[PDB]
Coordinates of C-alpha atoms in Angstrom, one line a residue:
Chain A
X9 CA 0.0 0.0 0.0
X10 CA 1.0 3.7 -0.4
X11 CA 1.1 4.4 3.3
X12 CA 3.4 1.5 4.0
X13 CA 5.7 2.1 0.9
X14 CA 6.0 5.8 1.9
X15 CA 6.8 4.9 5.5
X16 CA 9.6 2.5 4.3
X17 CA 11.1 5.3 2.1
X18 CA 11.1 7.8 5.0
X19 CA -9.1 1.7 1.2
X20 CA -8.7 -1.3 -1.0
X21 CA -12.4 -2.1 -0.5
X22 CA -14.0 0.8 -2.5
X23 CA -11.2 1.3 -5.1
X24 CA -11.1 0.0 -8.7
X25 CA -11.2 -3.7 -9.5
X26 CA -12.1 -5.9 -12.5
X27 CA -15.4 -7.8 -12.4
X28 CA -16.6 -10.4 -14.8
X29 CA -20.3 -9.7 -15.3
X30 CA -21.0 -13.4 -15.9
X31 CA -20.1 -14.1 -12.2
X32 CA -22.6 -14.9 -9.5
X33 CA -23.6 -11.9 -7.4
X34 CA -25.0 -14.1 -4.7
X35 CA -23.7 -13.3 -1.2
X36 CA -21.7 -15.7 1.0
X37 CA -20.4 -17.7 -2.0
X38 CA -24.0 -19.1 -2.7
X39 CA -24.8 -20.9 -6.0
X40 CA -27.8 -21.5 -8.2
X41 CA -30.1 -24.5 -8.1
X42 CA -28.8 -25.6 -11.4
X43 CA -25.2 -25.6 -10.2
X44 CA -26.3 -27.6 -7.2
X45 CA -28.0 -30.2 -9.4
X46 CA -25.0 -30.6 -11.6
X47 CA -22.6 -31.0 -8.7
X48 CA -24.8 -33.7 -7.2
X49 CA -25.0 -35.4 -10.6
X50 CA -21.2 -35.7 -10.9
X51 CA -20.4 -36.7 -7.3
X52 CA -20.2 -40.2 -6.1
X53 CA -19.4 -39.9 -2.4
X54 CA -21.4 -38.1 0.3
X55 CA -21.6 -37.8 4.0
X56 CA -25.0 -38.3 5.6
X57 CA -25.8 -37.1 9.2
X58 CA -28.8 -38.5 11.0
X59 CA -29.7 -38.3 14.7
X60 CA -29.5 -41.1 17.2
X61 CA -30.5 -41.1 20.9
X62 CA -27.5 -41.0 23.2
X63 CA -26.7 -42.1 26.7
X64 CA -27.9 -38.9 28.2
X65 CA -31.3 -39.0 26.3
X66 CA -30.0 -36.3 24.0
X67 CA -30.0 -36.6 20.2
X68 CA -26.6 -36.6 18.5
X69 CA -25.5 -36.9 14.9
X70 CA -23.6 -39.7 13.2
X71 CA -21.6 -38.9 10.1
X72 CA -21.3 -41.6 7.5
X73 CA -19.3 -41.4 4.3
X74 CA -20.9 -43.5 1.5
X75 CA -21.6 -43.9 -2.1
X76 CA -24.8 -42.2 -3.4
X77 CA -26.8 -41.4 -6.5
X78 CA -29.0 -38.4 -7.2
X79 CA -32.3 -39.2 -9.0
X80 CA -33.5 -35.9 -10.3
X81 CA -37.0 -37.0 -11.4
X82 CA -37.9 -38.8 -8.2
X83 CA -36.5 -35.9 -6.2
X84 CA -34.3 -38.0 -4.0
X85 CA -30.8 -39.4 -3.3
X86 CA -30.2 -43.1 -2.8
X87 CA -27.6 -45.0 -0.8
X88 CA -27.1 -48.2 1.2
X89 CA -25.6 -48.6 4.7
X90 CA -26.0 -51.0 7.6
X91 CA -24.6 -48.5 10.1
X92 CA -27.0 -47.8 13.0
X93 CA -27.0 -46.7 16.5
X94 CA -29.4 -47.8 19.3
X95 CA -32.7 -45.8 18.7
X96 CA -33.1 -43.0 16.2
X97 CA -34.0 -39.6 17.7
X98 CA -37.1 -39.4 15.6
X99 CA -40.8 -40.3 15.4
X100 CA -41.9 -42.1 12.2
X101 CA -41.0 -44.5 9.5
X102 CA -38.8 -41.9 7.9
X103 CA -36.0 -39.8 9.6
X104 CA -34.6 -36.4 8.9
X105 CA -31.3 -36.5 7.2
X106 CA -28.7 -34.1 6.1
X107 CA -26.5 -35.0 3.2
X108 CA -23.3 -33.3 2.1
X109 CA -21.4 -33.6 -1.2
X110 CA -18.2 -31.6 -1.9
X111 CA -15.3 -31.1 -4.3
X112 CA -12.2 -30.2 -2.3
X113 CA -9.3 -28.7 -4.2
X114 CA -6.0 -27.3 -3.0
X115 CA -5.0 -25.5 0.1
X116 CA -4.2 -21.9 -0.9
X117 CA -1.2 -20.3 0.8
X118 CA -1.0 -16.6 1.8
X119 CA 1.3 -14.2 3.7
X120 CA -1.9 -13.1 5.5
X121 CA -2.8 -15.7 8.1
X122 CA -6.5 -15.3 7.9
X123 CA -6.5 -15.6 4.1
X124 CA -5.2 -19.1 4.3
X125 CA -7.9 -21.3 2.8
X126 CA -8.8 -24.4 0.8
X127 CA -10.7 -24.5 -2.5
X128 CA -14.1 -26.1 -2.2
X129 CA -17.5 -26.6 -3.7
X130 CA -20.1 -27.9 -1.3
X131 CA -23.8 -28.8 -1.2
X132 CA -25.9 -29.5 1.9
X133 CA -29.2 -31.3 1.3
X134 CA -32.0 -31.4 3.9
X135 CA -34.7 -34.0 3.7
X136 CA -36.3 -37.2 5.0
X137 CA -34.8 -40.6 4.6
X138 CA -36.8 -43.8 4.5
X139 CA -35.8 -47.5 4.0
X140 CA -36.9 -49.0 0.6
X141 CA -38.2 -52.6 0.2
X142 CA -38.5 -55.1 -2.6
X143 CA -38.3 -53.8 -6.2
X144 CA -38.0 -50.2 -5.0
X145 CA -34.8 -51.3 -3.2
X146 CA -33.6 -53.4 -6.1
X147 CA -34.1 -50.5 -8.5
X148 CA -32.4 -48.0 -6.2
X149 CA -29.4 -50.3 -5.7
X150 CA -29.2 -50.9 -9.4
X151 CA -29.3 -47.1 -10.2
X152 CA -26.7 -46.6 -7.5
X153 CA -24.3 -49.4 -8.7
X154 CA -24.6 -48.4 -12.4
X155 CA -24.0 -44.7 -11.5
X156 CA -20.8 -45.2 -9.4
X157 CA -19.4 -48.0 -11.6
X158 CA -19.9 -46.5 -15.1
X159 CA -20.3 -49.2 -17.7
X160 CA -21.3 -51.8 -15.1
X161 CA -24.7 -53.4 -15.7
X162 CA -26.5 -55.4 -13.0
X163 CA -27.7 -58.7 -14.5
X164 CA -24.9 -58.7 -17.1
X165 CA -21.6 -57.6 -15.5
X166 CA -23.0 -58.8 -12.2
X167 CA -25.5 -61.5 -11.2
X168 CA -28.9 -60.0 -10.5
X169 CA -29.7 -58.6 -7.1
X170 CA -31.4 -61.5 -5.2
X171 CA -34.0 -61.5 -2.5
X172 CA -31.2 -62.6 -0.1
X173 CA -29.2 -59.6 -1.1
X174 CA -32.1 -57.3 -0.3
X175 CA -32.6 -59.0 3.1
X176 CA -29.0 -58.3 4.0
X177 CA -29.0 -54.6 3.0
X178 CA -30.6 -51.3 4.2
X179 CA -31.3 -49.2 1.1
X180 CA -32.5 -45.6 1.7
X181 CA -34.3 -42.9 -0.3
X182 CA -33.6 -39.4 1.0
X183 CA -36.4 -37.3 -0.3
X184 CA -35.1 -33.7 -0.8
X185 CA -36.9 -30.8 0.9
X186 CA -34.2 -28.1 0.5
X187 CA -30.6 -27.7 -0.5
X188 CA -27.8 -25.2 -0.2
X189 CA -24.8 -24.7 -2.6
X190 CA -21.5 -22.9 -1.8
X191 CA -18.3 -22.3 -3.9
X192 CA -15.0 -20.7 -3.2
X193 CA -12.6 -21.9 -5.8
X194 CA -10.3 -19.0 -6.3
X195 CA -6.9 -19.7 -8.0
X196 CA -4.9 -17.8 -5.4
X197 CA -5.7 -16.6 -1.8
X198 CA -5.8 -12.8 -1.2
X199 CA -2.3 -11.7 -0.2
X200 CA -1.0 -8.9 2.1
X201 CA 1.0 -6.4 0.0
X202 CA 2.7 -4.9 3.1
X203 CA 4.4 -8.1 4.2
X204 CA 7.1 -10.0 2.2
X205 CA 5.5 -11.9 -0.6
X206 CA 5.4 -15.7 -0.5
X207 CA 8.4 -17.3 -2.2
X208 CA 8.3 -19.5 -5.3
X209 CA 8.2 -22.5 -3.1
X210 CA 4.5 -21.6 -2.3
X211 CA 2.9 -20.3 -5.4
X212 CA 5.0 -22.0 -8.2
Chain B
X27 CA -18.3 -73.8 -6.8
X28 CA -18.5 -77.6 -7.2
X29 CA -22.3 -77.7 -7.3
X30 CA -22.5 -75.1 -10.1
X31 CA -19.5 -76.6 -12.1
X32 CA -21.1 -80.1 -11.9
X33 CA -24.5 -78.7 -13.0
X34 CA -22.9 -77.1 -16.1
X35 CA -21.1 -80.4 -17.0
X36 CA -24.3 -82.3 -16.7
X37 CA -20.0 -73.8 2.4
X38 CA -17.3 -71.2 1.6
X39 CA -17.7 -69.8 5.2
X40 CA -16.2 -72.7 7.2
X41 CA -13.7 -74.0 4.6
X42 CA -9.9 -73.3 4.5
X43 CA -8.5 -69.8 4.1
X44 CA -5.3 -68.0 4.7
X45 CA -5.1 -65.6 7.6
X46 CA -2.3 -63.3 8.6
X47 CA -2.0 -63.5 12.4
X48 CA -0.8 -59.8 12.5
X49 CA -4.3 -58.7 11.3
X50 CA -6.9 -57.0 13.6
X51 CA -9.5 -59.5 14.9
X52 CA -11.9 -56.7 15.9
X53 CA -15.4 -57.1 14.6
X54 CA -17.2 -54.8 12.1
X55 CA -13.9 -53.5 10.6
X56 CA -13.0 -51.7 13.9
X57 CA -9.4 -50.4 14.6
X58 CA -7.2 -49.6 17.6
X59 CA -6.9 -46.3 19.4
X60 CA -3.4 -46.0 18.1
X61 CA -4.6 -46.4 14.5
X62 CA -7.2 -43.7 15.1
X63 CA -4.6 -41.3 16.5
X64 CA -2.3 -41.7 13.5
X65 CA -5.1 -41.3 10.9
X66 CA -6.2 -38.1 12.7
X67 CA -2.6 -36.8 12.7
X68 CA -2.2 -37.3 9.0
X69 CA -5.5 -35.9 7.8
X70 CA -6.2 -32.2 7.1
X71 CA -9.9 -32.1 6.2
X72 CA -12.8 -33.1 8.3
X73 CA -16.5 -32.8 8.4
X74 CA -18.1 -31.5 11.6
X75 CA -21.8 -32.0 12.4
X76 CA -23.5 -29.9 15.1
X77 CA -27.1 -29.3 15.9
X78 CA -29.2 -26.3 15.1
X79 CA -32.8 -25.5 15.9
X80 CA -35.0 -25.8 12.9
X81 CA -38.3 -24.2 11.8
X82 CA -40.4 -26.9 13.5
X83 CA -38.5 -26.6 16.8
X84 CA -36.6 -29.8 16.1
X85 CA -32.8 -30.0 16.2
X86 CA -31.1 -30.9 13.0
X87 CA -27.5 -31.3 11.9
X88 CA -25.3 -29.2 9.7
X89 CA -22.4 -30.8 8.0
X90 CA -19.4 -28.6 7.3
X91 CA -16.2 -29.6 5.6
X92 CA -13.2 -27.8 6.9
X93 CA -9.5 -27.8 7.7
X94 CA -8.6 -29.2 11.1
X95 CA -5.7 -30.2 13.4
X96 CA -5.5 -32.8 16.1
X97 CA -3.7 -31.7 19.2
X98 CA -3.0 -35.0 21.1
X99 CA -1.7 -33.6 24.3
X100 CA -4.6 -31.1 24.8
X101 CA -7.0 -33.9 23.8
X102 CA -8.8 -31.8 21.2
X103 CA -9.2 -30.9 17.5
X104 CA -9.1 -27.3 16.3
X105 CA -10.8 -25.6 13.4
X106 CA -12.2 -22.2 12.3
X107 CA -15.6 -21.5 10.7
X108 CA -18.0 -18.7 10.5
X109 CA -20.9 -21.0 9.4
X110 CA -23.8 -20.7 11.8
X111 CA -27.6 -21.3 11.8
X112 CA -30.1 -19.4 13.9
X113 CA -29.9 -20.9 17.5
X114 CA -27.9 -24.0 18.4
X115 CA -29.9 -26.9 19.7
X116 CA -28.0 -26.9 23.0
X117 CA -27.7 -25.5 26.5
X118 CA -24.3 -24.0 27.4
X119 CA -21.1 -22.2 26.3
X120 CA -20.0 -25.4 24.5
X121 CA -21.9 -27.6 22.1
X122 CA -21.8 -31.3 21.3
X123 CA -20.0 -32.0 18.0
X124 CA -19.3 -35.0 15.9
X125 CA -16.2 -34.8 13.7
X126 CA -15.4 -37.3 10.9
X127 CA -12.1 -37.8 9.1
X128 CA -11.6 -40.3 6.3
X129 CA -9.3 -41.6 3.6
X130 CA -11.4 -42.7 0.6
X131 CA -9.7 -44.9 -1.9
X132 CA -11.0 -46.6 -5.1
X133 CA -14.4 -48.1 -5.9
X134 CA -14.0 -51.9 -6.0
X135 CA -15.9 -53.6 -8.9
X136 CA -17.4 -57.1 -8.5
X137 CA -19.6 -59.5 -10.5
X138 CA -21.6 -59.8 -7.2
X139 CA -23.8 -56.7 -6.8
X140 CA -23.8 -56.5 -3.1
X141 CA -20.0 -56.9 -3.0
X142 CA -19.6 -53.6 -4.8
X143 CA -17.8 -51.3 -2.4
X144 CA -15.3 -48.4 -2.0
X145 CA -12.0 -48.5 0.0
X146 CA -12.2 -46.4 3.1
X147 CA -10.6 -45.6 6.4
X148 CA -12.9 -43.5 8.7
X149 CA -12.9 -42.0 12.2
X150 CA -15.8 -40.5 14.1
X151 CA -15.0 -38.3 17.1
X152 CA -17.6 -37.3 19.7
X153 CA -17.0 -34.4 22.0
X154 CA -17.9 -30.9 23.0
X155 CA -16.9 -27.8 20.9
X156 CA -16.2 -24.4 22.4
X157 CA -15.2 -21.0 20.9
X158 CA -11.6 -19.9 21.9
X159 CA -10.6 -16.3 22.6
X160 CA -7.4 -14.3 22.6
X161 CA -4.1 -16.1 22.8
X162 CA -5.9 -19.5 23.0
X163 CA -7.5 -18.7 19.6
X164 CA -4.2 -17.3 18.2
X165 CA -2.3 -20.4 19.3
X166 CA -5.0 -22.7 17.9
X167 CA -5.1 -20.9 14.5
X168 CA -1.3 -21.0 14.4
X169 CA -1.1 -24.8 15.1
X170 CA -3.9 -25.3 12.5
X171 CA -2.2 -23.1 9.8
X172 CA 1.3 -24.6 10.4
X173 CA -0.1 -28.2 10.3
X174 CA -2.1 -27.9 7.1
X175 CA 0.6 -25.7 5.3
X176 CA 3.8 -27.6 6.2
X177 CA 6.8 -25.3 6.3
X178 CA 4.6 -22.2 6.7
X179 CA 5.4 -20.2 9.9
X180 CA 3.0 -17.5 11.2
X181 CA 5.0 -14.4 11.9
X182 CA 7.6 -15.2 9.2
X183 CA 5.9 -16.6 6.1
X184 CA 2.8 -14.6 7.2
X185 CA 2.3 -11.5 9.1
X186 CA 1.3 -12.2 12.7
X187 CA -2.4 -12.9 13.6
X188 CA -3.8 -9.6 14.7
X189 CA -6.5 -8.7 17.2
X190 CA -8.7 -7.7 14.2
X191 CA -8.1 -11.2 12.7
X192 CA -9.3 -12.8 15.8
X193 CA -12.4 -10.6 15.9
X194 CA -13.4 -11.7 12.5
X195 CA -12.9 -15.5 13.1
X196 CA -14.7 -18.1 15.1
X197 CA -12.0 -20.6 16.3
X198 CA -13.1 -23.8 18.1
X199 CA -11.6 -26.5 20.3
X200 CA -13.5 -29.8 20.1
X201 CA -12.6 -31.6 23.3
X202 CA -12.6 -35.4 22.6
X203 CA -14.9 -37.7 24.7
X204 CA -14.9 -40.8 22.6
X205 CA -13.9 -41.9 19.1
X206 CA -14.5 -44.8 16.7
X207 CA -12.2 -46.1 13.9
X208 CA -13.2 -48.2 10.9
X209 CA -11.2 -49.6 7.9
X210 CA -12.1 -51.7 4.9
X211 CA -9.3 -51.3 2.5
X212 CA -9.2 -54.6 0.6
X213 CA -7.4 -54.7 -2.8
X214 CA -10.3 -56.5 -4.5
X215 CA -13.9 -57.0 -3.7
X216 CA -15.2 -60.5 -3.1
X217 CA -16.3 -62.0 -6.4
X218 CA -19.0 -64.6 -7.3
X219 CA -17.3 -67.6 -8.8
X220 CA -20.6 -68.9 -10.4
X221 CA -21.1 -65.9 -12.6
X222 CA -18.8 -64.8 -15.5
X223 CA -15.7 -63.2 -14.1
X224 CA -15.2 -59.4 -14.6
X225 CA -13.2 -58.6 -17.7
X226 CA -9.8 -57.0 -17.9
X227 CA -11.5 -53.6 -18.3
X228 CA -12.5 -53.8 -14.6
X229 CA -9.7 -55.3 -12.7
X230 CA -6.6 -54.4 -14.8

């Protein structure tokens, strides 16, 4: 900055910058519904959080990483997992679930400590999960399988999904109520001009 | 299998196998406390789930991906995030938090549909998170920064963390109560001998 330069020889916010007009003007790094849909379509791993009753009676969340598939027409995501707790912290045949999908890029170095960051794109989905049965479960497991193993075809590449298979597996449909999308994927973190610039080790 | 082979020309569980005696005999893919510690020490990204009060009064979990650092002596994990909801679903200055760290490897193809899987190592930590202030916050942010940017040194590579920095950042210590460790990192999924084997496209 001038003040600092001048002091050696002896604000930013409102001053000129370049802006691409094609860029999202949404606050807090938020993204469009279309962007959310497309990120969900290309991901294969999510974390799901659901609530279980703990020792003290209080609900608490599990976090499970797992394979998933977004089914846009049905308005849900499907996954399978045999992870459970004792009792769910919930009344009903379905349970509230939060699902997160992200693309995590590189850590971005800076000479300004609070500008250190990591590149990310991240969606949170809020909805209700329910266990599927019979042909609903078979179809969901097939869609899942054929999504995350591109080119695999159940019944050809694999034997068909049997009744025994279904008995041994908990397959869920998380029906979407709402979702959130967030991106900060800058190429470089903001740097502090009035401190020695990062060396070539960091940015090259 | 014999039965199938013989039928073409016209159980597994209790029969001989190889076992390495050095391998974990823990059920359900569980791992030792030492293994958990070391996985936490080498990771840099976690998801944290905490409970927020929703529209219907009911608590529900957020899932936030973020940079973290395990501090073994203090018995906590540190991270920073300005993500919040409206009101936390919790009484106190601290809040219950679940933190998950994983190493996700490759999807493992099979000719048996319910043997399709993904390689993973995964830890869940259960504890109480609290906001840090002043030099506690500065020290935690420094440990975090210098952990996830190896070779970076706050005060040299970067300018020091200022009071303004701290005012603008929510830095947390998640004090560990319990943790869980899980690994299934086989080289190949279990295959079905009585269905055509996967082609070289899949396993080669």
